């Protein structure tokens, strides 16, 4: 509850600051300043076509690691277990197979911007 | 060992074997335009070996005793019967050609086994990719149906792109009234009595199609009879040549291994040549075939695998 008192505010501090930006400038919107930019010319294509990225494979290796990062995060509590020898090893096993998984891709030209 | 995959891991890597002259050179031309003083003397001058023209009977020379077998076992082609009497309803014009494509392909496959092991080049002559030249020459003139040209380019679509290009083709043009003279000055009656329009559709079907569509995947050394006929200056242009522009350089060892297991298994080299597209020129029926398959295994020496034939030696016919 104490945080809702902080954060509904900041929406209003933003939402009250935007209504006083559209309804207090005296605008003159007609046709040719609303249309898109491309540096002083009429855009050839439609601005919403396939971009065809080139880091497509790295975006997935991130998509797999954000799990792996999440899969690390309980270590500050895991050290407060009584064993601290499986936590020792199994923390080496997770970080090692990652670097093995990272070094294989590093050599097989994964993070290299196909071109 | 049969090279498996263990051998690669155990160590038989092909890039480890590639020499500078480990290049599958080829040479192309017309029907009496060199290639027999030129294929030889590029081999002997560089170091690598020589495969001659794949005739009707290539598969019979690399198998068993190597003896040229009867015409019915190695096809039923009879090249000599083509020139003197074409356009026969007994389809020979095309049986002559689909059998050679297969054997120009088995030739090329049998090269890459040797190019990709004990690395030497291979000096072919009129390899796979210059095999359509006859067909267009044989189709523009009336010898083949359009219901059969499709059967060929089909097979080329299924067998070609698995293989790699002829890797710096060579060519010697020669004006078509001249090649007709070398034939007639070469005492064969069959190669004679050929239309010089069939030998103008041979080089119209070369410099319009082959030479342009190959000058991007590979390299071209377009010469003439006099730039050739001194076969050292053709070799020297091969030595001081800047190999680029092809699939050979943009691929790895494990791209050869699955191209090298593709090429050992000659059955796998030829599955898409035996397709059941039932054409009368190429379909032969059962009684014509069962007579031949069984009268081929009754041959004194095949009868069995290539190692178990007690009639031609094979002393350990009960263990090995």
């Amino acid at each position: 509850m104490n945080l809702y008192t902080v954060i509904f505010i900041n929406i209003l501090l933003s939402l009250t600051l935007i209504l006083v930006a559209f309804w207090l400038p005296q605008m003159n919107l007609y046709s040719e300043k609303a249309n898109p930019y491309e540096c002083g010319f009429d855009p050839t294509s439609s601005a919403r076509l396939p971009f065809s990225m080139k880091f497509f494979l790295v975006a997935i290796t991130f998509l797999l690691f954000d799990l792996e990062i999440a899969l690390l995060l309980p270590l500050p509590w895991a050290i407060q277990t009584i064993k601290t020898s499986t936590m020792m090893i199994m923390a080496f096993i997770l970080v090692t197979i990652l670097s093995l998984g990272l070094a294989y891709e590093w050599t097989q030209k994964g993070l290299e911007w196909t071109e | 060992l049969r090279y498996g995959l263990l051998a690669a891991i155990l160590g038989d890597k092909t890039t480890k074997k590639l020499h500078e002259y480990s290049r599958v050179i080829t040479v192309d031309g017309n029907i009496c335009s060199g290639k027999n003083k030129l294929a030889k003397e590029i081999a002997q001058q560089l170091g690598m070996k020589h495969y001659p023209e794949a005739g009707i009977q290539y598969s019979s020379t690399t198998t068993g005793d190597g003896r040229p077998l009867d015409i019915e076992f190695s096809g039923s082609c009879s090249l000599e019967k083509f020139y003197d009497d074409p356009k026969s309803n007994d389809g020979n014009s095309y049986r002559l050609q689909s059998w050679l494509y297969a054997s120009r392909l088995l030739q090329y496959a049998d090269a890459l086994e040797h190019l990709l092991s004990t690395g030497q080049g291979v000096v072919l002559e009129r390899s796979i990719y210059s095999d359509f030249v006859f067909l267009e020459a044989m189709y523009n003139q009336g010898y083949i149906r359009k219901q059969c040209v499709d059967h060929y380019n089909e097979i080329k679509r299924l067998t070609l792109p698995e293989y790699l290009p002829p890797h710096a083709v060579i060519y010697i043009d020669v004006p078509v009234p001249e090649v007709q003279s070398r034939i007639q000055k070469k005492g064969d009656p069959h190669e004679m009595k050929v239309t010089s329009a069939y030998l103008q559709d041979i080089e119209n079907a070369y410099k319009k199609t082959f030479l342009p569509k190959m000058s991007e995947m590979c390299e071209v050394l377009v010469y003439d009879s006099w730039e050739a006929e001194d076969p050292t200056k053709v070799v020297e242009d091969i030595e001081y040549l800047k190999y680029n522009k092809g699939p050979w350089l943009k691929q790895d060892d494990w791209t050869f291994h699955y191209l090298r297991m593709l090429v050992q298994d000659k059955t796998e080299v030829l599955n898409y040549t035996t397709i059941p597209v039932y054409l009368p020129e190429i379909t032969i029926g059962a009684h014509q075939g069962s007579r031949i398959y069984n009268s081929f295994r009754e041959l004194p020496g095949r009868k069995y695998a290539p190692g178990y034939n007690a009639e031609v030696g094979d002393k350990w016919i009960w263990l090995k």
Binding site: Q80, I82, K83, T84, S85, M88, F92, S99 | -
Partner: protein, 83 residues
């Protein structure tokens, strides 16, 4: 050696990152095996009484800690102090 030991010299001049990583990797697992104080991590972490220690009931047995905490018997860790 030379054909391995002098290869590390360029890999330390150029590529001077993987050498640290491949070292600190190999230098991480190896140190707890040659420590004097690694025994205590599973012990300093086992002393913490997060839950309440349930007492047993005296039945003429177990000459352990009597019904008195400051009594010299029992797991009296004077090793945590004076570490």
């Amino acid at each position: 050696a030379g054909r391995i030991s002098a290869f590390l010299k360029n890999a330390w001049a150029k590529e001077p990152v993987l050498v640290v990583s491949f070292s600190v990797w190999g230098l991480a697992i190896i140190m707890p095996m040659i420590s004097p104080y690694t025994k205590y991590a599973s012990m300093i972490n086992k002393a913490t009484p997060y839950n309440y220690p349930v007492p047993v009931r005296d039945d003429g047995n177990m000459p352990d800690v009597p019904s008195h905490p400051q009594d010299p018997l029992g797991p009296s860790l004077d090793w945590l102090k004076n570490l």
